[PDB]
Amino acid sequence: TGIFMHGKIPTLKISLIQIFRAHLWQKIHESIVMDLCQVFDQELDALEI
RNA sequence: UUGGAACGAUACAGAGAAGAUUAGCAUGGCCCCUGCGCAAGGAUGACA
Numbered sequence: 001t002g003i004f005m006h007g008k009i010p011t012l013k014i015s016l017i018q019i020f021r022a023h024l025w026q027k028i029h030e031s032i033v034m035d036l037c038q039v040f041d042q043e044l045d046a047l048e049i
Numbered sequence: 050u051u052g053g054a055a056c057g058a059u060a061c062a063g064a065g066a067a068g069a070u071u072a073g074c075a076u077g078g079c080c081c082c083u084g085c086g087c088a089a090g091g092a093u094g095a096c097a
Contacts, residue, residue, distance in 0.1 A: 014065065021064050 001025045 001020045005013060040049065 010065095018064060018066055021066090023063090 001016065002025060003016055003020070040047075043049070
């Protein structure tokens with residue numbers, strides 16, 4: 001994740017590991033990348049792309 | 050070609066959660082009830 005731990009809060013570390021399991025950060029980034037691709041793919045002949 | 054480092058580096062993976070999870074029936078315990086067997090035992094009905 002991109003979460004920076006300011007001190008060893010072990011309970012918070014475990015919670016954030018459970019919340020961002022199965023590579024959720026990469027999946028979120030990829031999904032937003034795909035969404036921007038589609039929103040820019042639709043308007044390619046109007047934005048002169 | 051030949052040496053550092055090897056409690057390191059990188060590669061993969063990363064849920065570092067929490068657990069002997071859970072549905073059915075039968076057995077077993079208890080109290081009846083019903084049927085049959087076994088061993089005995091009660092009370093009672095019946096003329097020429």
